[PDB]
Design a protein around this ligand. Structure first.
Ligand SMILES: *[C@@H]1O[C@H](CO)[C@@H](O[C@@H]2O[C@H](CO)[C@@H](O[C@@H]3O[C@H](CO)[C@@H](O)[C@H](O)[C@@H]3O)[C@H](O)[C@H]2NC(C)=O)[C@H](O)[C@H]1NC(C)=O
Ligand SMILES: *[C@@H]1O[C@H](CO)[C@@H](O[C@@H]2O[C@H](CO)[C@@H](O[C@@H]3O[C@H](CO)[C@@H](O)[C@H](O)[C@@H]3O)[C@H](O)[C@H]2NC(C)=O)[C@H](O)[C@H]1NC(C)=O
Ligand SMILES: *[C@@H]1O[C@H](CO)[C@@H](O[C@@H]2O[C@H](CO)[C@@H](O[C@@H]3O[C@H](CO)[C@@H](O)[C@H](O)[C@@H]3O)[C@H](O)[C@H]2NC(C)=O)[C@H](O)[C@H]1NC(C)=O
Ligand SMILES: *[C@@H]1O[C@H](CO)[C@@H](O[C@@H]2O[C@H](CO)[C@@H](O)[C@H](O)[C@H]2NC(C)=O)[C@H](O)[C@H]1NC(C)=O
Lengths: 395, 395
């Protein structure tokens, strides 16, 4: 009477510690009941490998916790998928990327940054890159023990000290006296739940402006940088415009637009704050996207720096009509609507096996016997993916 | 009988210390002898400020040495120009940027680097951004002083340790024994000729791989990194990308051809060498420009980071005919021929005064009274500019 459809799809990304283990649910409905088959990135199918992979009731695939000696790449680093099929057809769920991370020691360091008196200084906590995605900066702590980043999910921007949403610590108006203060960043492993203070203690090395200098970027000997950053909706972006000069310069921010060589000034309102040489955007919407330009000027000259912004939006899919009934030889239309950002590509599948059709909507001239089954619109960007399905019957 | 011309013109950038002082000289020929004035590109002419500037016996501009206190911004950091004048017309030299920097104290540091065993590690000597224009890495060395290598002195690419043109220290396939050793850099301020050792010592902190890891960037996110570099012709550039993973990934360097995104593989000849994940080009040329790419695939997955190179050639220009003799009413013009790279803009001037024409041909539909005089074609870009002079005479 009805084909298979996923009631609950597995999530895009599952990251878990060897100590933690993991569980992934897949359930689809229809009649007569669909099977539930776990499938690898390519094809074939999923077996149980005791102590590592098991399938429980409800059709849930579980990875129990394991000791480091038992780690296997083809198991733990693999990208999986769920398959549900009945007599009417088959449907594959969205791609499920599984990465297990065996618990290991690591140390976080806050290195010093060099700055001229006044202006603004910014200190970053240096986190090993390979662990970088599993660890986030929570707060910062000075010699007297003050927590600058520990209050609220949003920080007051009008004070001397501000902990940026990027985890980085921003300081307005560096004085000669504050150089005697040292700071430590606290990090927390999202899986283990362990918190640890930074190993080394960072400090500000302050150079006295005994002579004037143009704006100087972080690069050396003709080195510029274009930082392309992405942040999800409702989150908070931070745009960096690192510089040092004397006399202390002023930072004017601008925004390019689609296919333009020009720009316009940026709105400074309560939604989007600016602080010194750094711009913060709270409650990021999708329209905050597009090429941004920071320009630093003073009496002796000026320079600009480019940073581009793309706001991630959750992908989705809907096929219409969900269930279609068409005669023999008569065409039928499946249009796939979707919501999200960005979208790199869109695929199509018939009964679990993929077609080469790259367009959002697809057509069929004359309905034949082979044209009955389950179809799916696969929309995937580089970082994610999502899908829906539809049924077609003959009459 | 003849108009003004420069047989000697200053170089664009002149940098010097408070103790060193500096001189810049122009000279002019023609007939009768054109008078030589030193005028700010700001539009005003400068005279003799005692001890902080003056003019010597012949035509030249000299900045004497001075103690730190006597530093004045309006003199020591300024754009200047050289101007020749006679009854025929006027001409100006290229914009000369004079930058004086008083001797002061600074320190460099070598921060620790985090690396997965088997991967190549790159240690950086961190120097203040504002002294970056001057100081450059000379050599590295052991805890006891043993040199790992000296920058700019000869080479070889196949050894464990190699110091790159950028000044960084590269280590191939880091291992357990390396963790016990310290890496320590010496730098040289080229204006003061003084070399000092970094205040701190960097140490390699090695993590032992257990589970597999996709290729990881130096950024966490959400912030990948573009790098815009560039280098002088027949210099030595260095490309880069900071991949950290297990198992050790392989690096295939490609190059975006002109225009469209079509990729092309990079050749490794006796000149161009690739060690681990870092490409090098010795004796660079302008044709080496264009967007580059290094794709790092791994057993688990793959990722790509981009860099765009531009190699500069010295700027010059020549205007023909050197001197036109135009009859009354006939269109007569100078075309601007030149060589160099890059060129962002080109402008013109009528006997010292700016018009605002753009493309390098000036054509007027016919001559008049005022048209008689001097003309110049000024090619300009970020780092420098050059010029040429020409005349017409009504008849
Ligand atoms: C996930 O993997 C980690 C590996 O880092 C497991 O933690 C490790 O557990 C072993 C025990 O099997 C610890 O080794 C022990 O160390 C003590 C000295 O502290 C020694 O006396 C014992 O004989 C034994 O060798 C190891 O230190 C520990 N490492 C860390 C970083 O915690 C963890 O148990 C695994 N999760 C599981 C099995 O659920
Ligand atoms: C603040 O400083 C920036 C320097 O980064 C200034 O931007 C620069 O402005 C100059 C003119 O003021 C531009 O020069 C012009 O360029 C066009 C080509 O686009 C050329 O045809 C003109 O003849 C002229 O030379 C320069 O391109 C521009 N550079 C950048 C990177 O923006 C900015 O104007 C300064 N703002 C203020 C208010 O002074
Ligand atoms: C350019 O500026 C520098 C820095 O201001 C000048 O060098 C400095 O000279 C002073 C001497 O007036 C040095 O101070 C000290 O002198 C006492 C003796 O009274 C001595 O015991 C100390 O050991 C120290 O030398 C200062 O160290 C020195 N600093 C540097 C960086 O060189 C320099 O003289 C100026 N150039 C000219 C041409 O005057
Ligand atoms: C190396 O890594 C890349 C990822 O950057 C793999 O996938 C390519 O990804 C781009 C999108 O950035 C696609 O346009 C390409 O079509 C992908 N490659 C292919 C072959 O389809 C790439 O496949 C990896 N290569 C190897 C040999 O593993």
């Amino acid at each position: 009477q009805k084909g298979p459809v996923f009631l609950k799809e597995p999530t895009n990304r599952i990251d878990f510690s060897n100590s933690t283990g993991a569980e992934i649910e897949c359930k689809a409905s229809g009649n007569p009941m669909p099977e539930i088959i776990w499938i690898r990135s390519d094809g074939t199918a999923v077996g149980d490998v005791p102590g590592l992979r098991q399938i429980s009731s409800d059709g849930k695939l579980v990875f129990p916790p394991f000791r480091a000696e038992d780690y296997r790449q083809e198991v733990h680093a693999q990208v999986y998928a769920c398959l549900a099929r009945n007599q009417f057809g088959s449907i594959i769920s969205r791609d499920v990327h599984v990465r297990a991370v065996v618990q290991q020691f690591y140390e976080s360091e806050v290195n010093n940054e060099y700055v001229i008196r006044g202006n603004a200084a910014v200190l970053k906590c240096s986190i090993p890159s390979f662990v970088a995605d599993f660890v986030q900066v929570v707060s910062w702590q000075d010699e007297e023990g003050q927590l600058y980043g520990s209050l609220g999910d949003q920080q007051g921007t009008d004070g001397k000290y501000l902990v940026l949403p990027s985890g980085e610590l921003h300081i307005r108006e560096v004085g000669p006296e504050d150089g005697y203060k040292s700071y430590q960043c606290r990090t927390k492993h999202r899986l283990t739940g362990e918190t640890r203070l930074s190993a080394t203690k960072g400090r500000l090395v302050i150079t006295e402006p005994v002579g004037s200098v143009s704006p100087q970027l972080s690069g050396n000997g003709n080195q510029e940088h274009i930082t392309l950053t992405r942040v999800p909706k409702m989150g908070s972006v931070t745009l960096m415009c690192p510089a040092q000069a004397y006399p202390v310069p002023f930072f004017r921010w601008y925004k390019f637009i689609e296919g333009t060589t020009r720009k316009q000034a940026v709105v400074l309102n309560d939604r989007v704050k600016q602080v010194s040489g750094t711009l913060i955007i709270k409650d990021a919407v999708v329209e905050d996207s597009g090429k941004y330009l920071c320009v630093v000027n003073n009496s002796v000259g000026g320079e600009s720096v480019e940073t581009v912004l793309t706001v991630t939006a959750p992908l989705s899919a809907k096929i219409d009509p969900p269930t279609q009934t068409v005669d023999f030889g008569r065409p039928a239309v499946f249009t796939c609507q979707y919501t999200g950002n960005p979208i790199k590509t869109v695929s199509w599948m018939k009964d679990g096996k993929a077609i080469g059709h790259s367009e959002p909507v697809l057509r069929i001239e004359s309905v034949k016997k082979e044209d009955k089954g389950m179809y799916q619109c696969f929309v995937r960007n580089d970082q994610e993916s999502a899908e829906a399905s539809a049924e077609l019957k003959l009459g």
